[PDB]
Structures are given as C-alpha cells and as structure tokens.
Design a binder for this molecule. Structure first.
Ligand code: A1B7E
Ligand code: DK1
Ligand code: GLU
Lengths: 281, 285
C-alpha cells in the first residue's frame, strides 16, 4: 500500500503550523493537512484529532517526495516529546513514532546522529546543520572548546550559556563534555524564542543550538545584533534527514529523489523561498 | 585477501602526493602544533602525460582523507593498501564506441570493476553516482564559493556584478570542471555561464594566480579548496554565502559489508570532534 503515516513537529521555518481557514475547513495555498491530538481536559486522556495546516521547507520536501516517489500520506504532529530522546530506554518524539511503527517516516528539522541511526534509518541529508553558538555581537567565543564553556568556573563571573534540552545538541554536549553539560543545565531554555530574548536583553551570554535554526534566526534578527560565532562555525556538522524504519522499502527511492532535487536546482529554490534573511554575518 | 584496496586521487588538502626519500621512506614532517604528519605509502602512476605508460611506483600520501582512513582502519579493524587512480579522474560516465551505453572512468570505474574496494577521497555525492555505488553519510560538507582579492565585496551568486556581467568585473571557473557543468546545466545561470565561457581557465592553480595578478576578479570553485587557499594566501578571501551545497562521502559497492559501520564511524567522528580537528589541521591555519 502507498498511503503512509508520516510524523512531523513544528519548528519554523522548516515546519510551520497554521489554523485551518474557518470558512472552508480546507488547507489552501502552500499548505498541507496535518492533524494534532489535543486533550479535552487534564483529568482523562480523552482528546480530539484537530485538523490543522502545515507549511515550510520540510513540507515542500515532503510534497516533492510524495510526487516523485509516488505515495500519499496522513501527516500528524507528534505530541509525545519533540525531535527524539531515549528516556528510560524508550525513544520518544519523532524518532519514537518511527521506532514503534506509528509512522512510516518522520519529516522535519530532524538531526542525523549516531545513536538515532541505531534505531532508525536516515535518508541522505537535505539541510546542512550541526551545533552553532549564538551571541550578541561583540561577545567573544572561539567554538565549543572555548575555556569559558569547558571549565566555566575558571572565570569570575562564569559565562552564562545554555541550550534547549532533550535534543541532539544537549545529547552531544552531555556525551563529550560532562562538566560543561552539568554546569549548563541551570541555563536550560524552554524554547528558542525564550533564549533569543534572554540573549538580546543580556540575561544570557551564549545560546548553543541547532546550526540551521540559529543561522535562520540570525538572518532575520531585528537590527542584526544576534550572530552565530565564527565564519559560520558549525561543530559536529551533520544534516537533517528523513527518518525511516529500519529496512524501509522507501529509503532507496527517497535518497535518489533528494539527490535528484539537488542536481536539478530544486534545493536552491527552497532555500530562496524559506531560508534567506536580510542579515549576513 | 582481507586487505582492503583503497583508491584515492591527488587533491589538496585532502590528499597530498609526494615522492619517497632516497631510502624509500616518507619524510618526517610535523605541524608547528607538534604532531607528526601521518603518511602512508600509495602506489600509482607518476607520469600524467597522454598516451604514456602508467609505471606504478610507491609514493607518499597524507592529508585529511588519509587521516580519516587511518582512523577508520583502526576503529573498524581492517588493513588496507592505497593506490592512486590509474587514469587520474574522479569518475564520470563516458560513451563507448559503437554504443550509446556509458561506462564509468576514474575512481568510480575502479570501484565498480573491483580494482578497488573503497574510494577514500573527496568524492562528491550525487544522484548519478548513487545509482551505481553506495555512499557513506558525508565526511565533509561543503559547497561552491567565490575567491576574490581582499577588499572585494561580493554577496554570493546573487550579487549584481555576477547576475549582470560585464568585462569590468571578470569571473570564471575551470573549463570542463564540475562547476562548469553545473553552470551549463542550470538554465537560470545562462547569462553568467555566457560570461564565464569567455574567461574560464585551464586549471585552478592558474585561476587562483590570476586572482592574485588582478586579471581575474572572482574565481568560482569548491569551498573546501578555496578556504584552504585563503588560509595560506592572506591577499585572497572567500566571499558571500555558500551555494550549491554538497558533501563528500566514502564510496563502496552496493553489496559492501562495510557500508553501515563506515557511515556510523563518520557520524561518530563528527560528533566527538575528530572531524573538527581534521578541519583545523588541514583546511585552516
Ligand atoms: C546552517 C547552515 C545552512 N544550512 C543549509 N543547508 N542547506 C541549505 S540550502 C538547501 C540544500 O542545499 N540542501 C542540500 C544539501 C544539504 C547538505 C548536504 C549536501 C546537499 S542552507 C543554513 C541553514 C538555514 C539558514 C541559513 C543557512
Ligand atoms: O567529481 C568529484 O568528486 C570532484 C570534482 C572536483 O573538481 C573536486 C574538487 Cl575541484 C575539489 C575537491 Cl576537494 C573535490 C572534488 N571532487
Ligand atoms: N534538530 C535537533 C533539535 C534541536 C537541537 O537540539 O539542536 C534534533 O533533531 O534533536
């Protein structure tokens, strides 16, 4: 069968969620239907699958794959976690939906890393990403090995830096730099927007996060005051990839199609449409 | 045999190629930051001239790709022998006589024919090649960028002096190169290609020297190379955003029992900082 359950997660500009137009109850323009399970109340787990509309860079990738590889799909937004973390030996988020076979594939701002590749297969990367550091222009940081990150109490006052927990960036820091990581958790940010405000008003000195999202946010920052350190510095360079079930029959054709989109300039079109900003460096 | 046959190609800073010393060993070199340069013996032709015999002699190889090979070999517990691609090419499909059927040359051809078991080189991942071989996840992400003299301001491929060309600001790439083919293939770069066709150079060294000598104002080329060139030549800089992003991958045949773990090892090496260390050793300064 060629009708596929597919999971996604909102993260602008890769996946953006809109309400459906109330007069037509249809998703129009550049959007596709996507459902979200929403609870009635906090006492029971009864809920409704709410019809919404999705758009963005990764949604356009999905539309192109659906056409070229010839499948249709039922797109839903994950509500158990976010991108993916193993908690008590059980994967949640988009990764978990694929591992436990609720989704044939996961499409979104999903970082390829080694531990996820042990439990899902990833397509070729279709966005370059990794870990970057965002600061207010003027703040000096060499990279992740900067002593202010690695041995933070060697400085008075210590440097104030954090991430959004439970994603690939926190997992990388936890695995590589134990002292840094345990220091940082007091600066955990609830989301990217909170972190940007905290930086801009000087309550936080640096925000460590997915390179693609930070480069996008730097590109649209009001006044071009928040920047990623270095000459587009990226640590642990990787990509967003489509996650598929181990052994998936869809992987080969998805890989070839993504690589065909690159060769034919289609990827450059999506960059122009979704990823360009007015700030540069 | 269990020794893997590795094929590579001369392409700095990924693979340097030098003669052995008079006793057949490779010269001791270091970096100012201390570490001995790790070198491997690679056999290959040492006469490029057309119609020449391909006399295979031991040479010394080192660089980003050789360090990567050394690490993989140790991590995955394999032995290897390295040779330089006999015809000197990365790999394109060319026509046979009497047939519209194509055949791969270069490193692709050697991998497919069994003359190699693994391509360890800066081999661009693309659709055409992936139809025939398996690639790892990328060991290096890169793209096209623009080399100019310091002080020259160019935003990238959408800069007005690129999109609306004139002989007041000359830009160009290497004839018949992957970049030239890319500019030919894309219809929307037609006015730029027409300009470049009047000015393209025979080699990257020649283009890069022309930028130094103010005869070429911008050279369009692979960003890994151009960042390396900028790192040694302080009068030259890259400029603008990367475009036509791409990645280099290890190449293996479809049936290879090494493909899964080679790719996991590359992911591991990005995540633990090994790849960043290679970048600072070979691509920066
Ligand atoms: C964070 C740096 C930058 N990352 C990007 N990745 N891809 C684009 S364009 C889309 C594209 O070429 N995909 C194909 C590539 C994907 C990787 C392997 C080769 C084929 S920009 C970025 C992101 C967001 C805003 C500004 C800059
Ligand atoms: O066909 C190719 O793979 C190819 C082709 C090229 O021209 C390459 C150049 Cl200039 C530099 C580097 Cl680092 C890699 C290259 N790869
Ligand atoms: N893209 C990341 C989430 C953001 C981050 O942790 O940098 C992931 O897939 O986990």
């Amino acid at each position: 069968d060629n009708h596929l359950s597919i999971v996604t997660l909102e993260e602008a500009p890769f996946v953006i969620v809109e309400d459906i137009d109330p007069l037509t109850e249809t998703c129009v323009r550049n959007t596709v239907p996507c459902r979200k399970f929403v609870k009635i109340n906090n006492s029971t787990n009864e809920g409704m699958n709410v019809k919404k509309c999705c758009k963005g860079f990764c949604i356009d990738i999905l539309k192109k794959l659906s056409r070229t590889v010839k499948f249709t799909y039922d797109l839903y937004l994950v509500t158990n976690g976010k991108h993916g973390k193993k908690v008590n030996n059980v994967w949640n988020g988009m990764i978990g939906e694929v591992v436990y076979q609720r989704a044939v594939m996961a499409v979104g701002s999903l970082t390829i890393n080694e531990e996820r590749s042990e439990v899902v297969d990833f397509s070729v990367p279709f966005v370059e990403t990794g870990i970057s550091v965002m600061v207010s222009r003027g703040t000096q940081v060499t990279g992740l090995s900067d002593k202010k990150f690695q041995r933070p109490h060697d400085y008075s006052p210590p440097f104030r830096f954090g991430t959004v927990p439970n994603g690939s960036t926190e997992r990388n820091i936890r695995n590589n730099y134990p002292y840094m990581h345990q220091y940082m958790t007091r600066f955990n940010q609830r989301g990217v927007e909170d972190a940007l405000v905290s930086l801009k008003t000087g309550k936080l000195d640096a925000f460590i996060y997915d390179a693609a999202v930070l480069n996008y946010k730097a590109g649209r920052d009001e006044g071009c005051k928040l920047v990623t350190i270095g000459s587009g510095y990226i640590f642990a360079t990787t990509g967003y990839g489509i996650a598929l079930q181990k052994g998936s029959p869809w992987k080969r054709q998805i890989d070839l199609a993504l690589l065909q989109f690159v060769g034919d300039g289609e990827m450059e079109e999506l960059e122009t449409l979704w990823l360009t900003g007015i700030c540069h460096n | 045999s269990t020794r893997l046959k590795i094929v590579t190609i001369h392409q700095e800073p990924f693979v340097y190629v030098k003669p052995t010393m008079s006793d057949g060993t490779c010269k001791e070199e270091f970096t100012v930051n201390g570490d001995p340069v790790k070198k491997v013996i690679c056999t290959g032709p040492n006469d490029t001239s057309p119609g020449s015999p391909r006399h295979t002699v031991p040479q010394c190889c080192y660089g980003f790709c050789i360090d990567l090979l050394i690490k993989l070999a140790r991590t995955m517990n394999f032995t290897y022998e390295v040779h330089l691609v006999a015809d000197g090419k990365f790999g394109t499909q060319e026509r046979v006589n009497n047939s519209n059927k194509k055949e791969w040359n270069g490193m692709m051809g050697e991998l497919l024919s069994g003359q190699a078991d693994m391509i360890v080189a800066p081999l661009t991942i693309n659709n055409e090649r992936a139809q025939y071989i398996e690639f790892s996840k990328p060991f290096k992400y890169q793209g096209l960028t623009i080399l100019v003299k310091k002080g020259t301001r160019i935003t990238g491929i959408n800069d007005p002096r690129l999109r609306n060309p004139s002989d007041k600001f000359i830009y160009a790439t290497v004839k018949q190169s992957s970049v030239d083919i890319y500019f030919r293939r894309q219809v929307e770069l037609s006015t730029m290609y027409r300009h470049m066709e009047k000015h393209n150079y025979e080699s990257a060294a020649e283009a890069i020297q022309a930028v130094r000598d103010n005869k070429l104002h911008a050279f369009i080329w692979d960003s890994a190379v151009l960042e390396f060139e900028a790192s040694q030549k302080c009068d030259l800089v890259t400029t603008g955003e990367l475009f036509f992003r791409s990645g280099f991958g290890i190449g293996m045949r479809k049936d290879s029992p090494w493909k899964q773990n080679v790719s996991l090892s590359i992911l591991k090496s990005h995540e633990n900082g090994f790849m960043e260390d290679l970048d600072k050793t070979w691509v920066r300064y």
